[PDB]
């Protein structure tokens, strides 16, 4: 029931090696580029699929070309059986890398430097008029080249939504919007089925970095969406920072001040990470936790 069988060739050029990801809305393959001779990521959507989402993912990926933390766009197309996009192949995701660490915790020096890169990628997608709406560790992957192995890449625009109109204006929010993303790193706004904003992507970043540094979130054992929302709604969030750098209280306070309409202060949040590093003498050139160094 896979859309492409192994050794299937797309457009006489990309040869399927194996499936590397799957879900309701399509599949991702590692393929060999019979022209450039590197391997690539080949993401496919069944032609017959009711909700056609790939066309928007490709539009977002093309808008982001030239930005750091973005896969290179190789090709796309359309035929009677499937839509596809070919993109740069990336490596290990941050969820797998976090689980591989002894206590499921990154050093502050890894956490803060990933934070800078993820924040850059969030501002980037926001700058072309889209919300990601499923910011989570498994959607960020480290590079797999000498030129990219300390670079973090933003994946999966499958749940993204344009928050501007044709003419650059902020769109009206729907009075109710069904939150369809991952429970653990969802904002209290998303839990309430409110229209998501730029601030909700930065809430997801906040929860990710607490989990990175501390090794857990208070609700991690609870999978039910409506229970997790009720736990978050009451949780004293300044408790989450007990063992985090104090400069995180600026980040929390800022994103708590934001609504759907307000452009976030990305530079305020960047300065939290940069001041946290400077305080501790963390350098940018440091080993990540998962490297031999
Ligand atoms: C078109 C766009 C940007 O929206 C997308 C997307 C995308 C969704 C789901 C995915 N699952 C995986 C990947 C992936 C990508 C993946 N992608 C890449 N390029 N390298 C490596 C991997 C790791 C293997 C698993």
């Amino acid at each position: 029931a896979d859309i492409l069988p192994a050794n299937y060739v797309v457009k006489d050029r990309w040869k399927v090696l194996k499936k590397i990801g799957g879900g309701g809305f399509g599949e991702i393959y590692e393929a060999m580029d019979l022209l450039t001779r590197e391997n690539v990521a080949l993401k496919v959507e069944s032609a017959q699929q009711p909700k056609q989402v790939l066309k928007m993912e490709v539009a977002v990926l093309k808008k982001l070309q030239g930005k750091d933390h973005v896969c290179r766009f190789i090709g796309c197309g359309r035929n009677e059986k499937f839509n596809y996009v070919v993109m740069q192949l990336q490596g290990r995701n941050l969820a797998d890398l976090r689980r591989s660490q002894p206590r499921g915790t990154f050093t502050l020096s890894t956490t803060l430097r990933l934070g800078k890169q993820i924040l850059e990628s969030i501002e980037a997608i926001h700058s072309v008029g889209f919300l990601h709406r499923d910011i989570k560790p498994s959607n960020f992957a480290m590079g797999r080249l000498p030129s990219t192995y300390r670079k973090c890449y933003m994946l999966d625009f499958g749940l993204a939504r344009q928050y501007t109109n044709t003419t650059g204006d902020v769109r009206p929010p729907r009075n109710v919007a069904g939150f369809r993303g991952t429970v653990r790193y969802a904002s209290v706004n998303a839990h309430k089925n409110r229209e998501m904003g730029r601030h909700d992507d930065l809430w997801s970043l906040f929860y990710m970095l607490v989990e990175f540094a501390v090794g857990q979130l208070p609700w991690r054992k609870i999978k039910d969406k409506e229970q997790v929302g009720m736990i978050k709604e009451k949780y004293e969030h300044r408790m989450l920072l007990k063992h985090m750098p104090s400069e995180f209280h600026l980040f929390l306070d800022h994103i708590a001040s934001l609504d759907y309409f307000t452009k976030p202060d990305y530079q305020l949040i960047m300065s939290v990470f940069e001041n946290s590093m400077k305080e501790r003498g963390i350098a940018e050139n440091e080993a990540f936790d998962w490297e031999k160094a």
Side-chain angles (χ1 to χ4, degrees):
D2 273 355
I3 296 167
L4 307 178
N7 310 319
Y8 187 97
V9 180
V10 178
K11 188 182 133 195
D12 296 310
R13 170 154 177 193
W14 305 282
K15 185 172 109 285
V16 171
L17 299 178
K18 62 184 183 181
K19 178 165 139 201
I20 58 175
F25 298 72
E27 294 151 16
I28 313 92
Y29 301 85
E30 186 169 342
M32 194 183 161
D33 197 318
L34 300 172
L35 184 59
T36 73
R37 305 299 288 180
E38 71 166 7
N39 288 355
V40 299
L42 173 67
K43 181 169 209 288
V44 309
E45 162 187 83
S46 168
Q48 309 317 323
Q49 181 144 300
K51 306 198 162 167
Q52 294 256 313
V53 177
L54 192 55
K55 183 193 112 158
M56 169 195 78
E57 297 183 57
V58 172
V60 174
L61 187 63
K62 286 177 167 179
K63 283 168 197 283
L64 282 177
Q65 296 298 292
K67 302 280 189 187
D68 213 335
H69 312 298
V70 170
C71 294
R72 195 169 53 94
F73 166 84
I74 295 177
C76 62
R78 209 199 269 300
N79 56 54
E80 57 263 51
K81 286 289 155 50
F82 63 92
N83 308 315
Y84 72 89
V85 58
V86 195
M87 68 192 136
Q88 183 177 8
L89 185 65
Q90 300 302 350
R92 299 157 292 178
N93 81 48
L94 294 191
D96 292 337
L97 280 169
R98 188 181 65 79
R99 279 186 300 257
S100 291
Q101 298 307 292
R103 308 183 302 94
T105 68
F106 290 143
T107 55
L108 216 38
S109 166
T110 286
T111 295
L112 293 176
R113 285 175 297 124
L114 286 175
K116 291 181 34 176
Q117 290 195 46
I118 300 158
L119 175 64
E120 282 177 358
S121 71
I122 289 172
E123 186 171 8
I125 190 176
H126 289 174
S127 78
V128 303
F130 281 79
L131 310 177
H132 190 287
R133 302 197 305 172
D134 209 21
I135 296 292
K136 66 187 177 174
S138 63
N139 279 343
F140 289 88
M142 297 303 301
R144 62 190 292 142
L145 303 173
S147 61
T148 66
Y149 70 104
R150 284 190 185 167
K151 282 183 202 167
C152 192
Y153 294 85
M154 170 182 270
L155 305 181
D156 199 353
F157 304 152
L159 292 179
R161 180 186 168 83
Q162 187 166 347
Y163 70 82
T164 60
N165 63 359
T166 170
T167 49
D169 311 300
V170 169
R171 301 172 81 159
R174 289 163 300 177
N175 185 236
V176 184
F179 176 62
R180 280 176 190 88
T182 309
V183 166
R184 191 176 301 167
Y185 317 92
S187 80
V188 160
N189 305 313
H191 274 286
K192 289 182 196 261
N193 289 316
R194 287 183 184 158
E195 194 76 66
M196 291 177 70
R198 291 172 280 189
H199 60 320
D200 296 312
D201 280 348
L202 295 171
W203 271 116
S204 303
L205 173 63
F206 181 86
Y207 291 146
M208 289 184 57
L209 299 183
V210 169
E211 182 180 67
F212 283 182
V214 168
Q216 46 173 262
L217 294 161
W219 44 85
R220 65 193 176 289
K221 295 298 166 56
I222 310 285
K223 300 227 300 190
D224 183 66
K225 186 181 314 202
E226 189 162 20
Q227 290 288 317
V228 168
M230 289 187 309
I231 297 162
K232 290 172 179 167
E233 194 192 29
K234 300 305 189 155
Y235 200 87
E236 174 47 76
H237 276 57
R238 286 204 203 276
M239 277 182 58
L240 293 175
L241 297 182
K242 199 158 189 271
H243 301 300
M244 300 288 280
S246 63
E247 273 270 331
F248 277 62
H249 285 284
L250 293 171
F251 177 12
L252 176 50
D253 276 322
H254 173 70
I255 67 175
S257 78
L258 292 178
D259 63 17
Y260 173 79
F261 296 98
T262 316
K263 184 178 191 189
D265 193 341
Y266 306 93
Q267 184 45 239
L268 181 161
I269 300 168
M270 188 60 77
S271 290
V272 164
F273 308 153
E274 288 181 338
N275 288 341
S276 310
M277 287 165 62
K278 211 202 166 196
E279 268 165 344
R280 287 168 182 74
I282 296 150
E284 189 83 308
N285 77 280
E286 275 185 27
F288 283 114
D289 294 336
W290 49 81
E291 308 172 356
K292 284 299 179 157

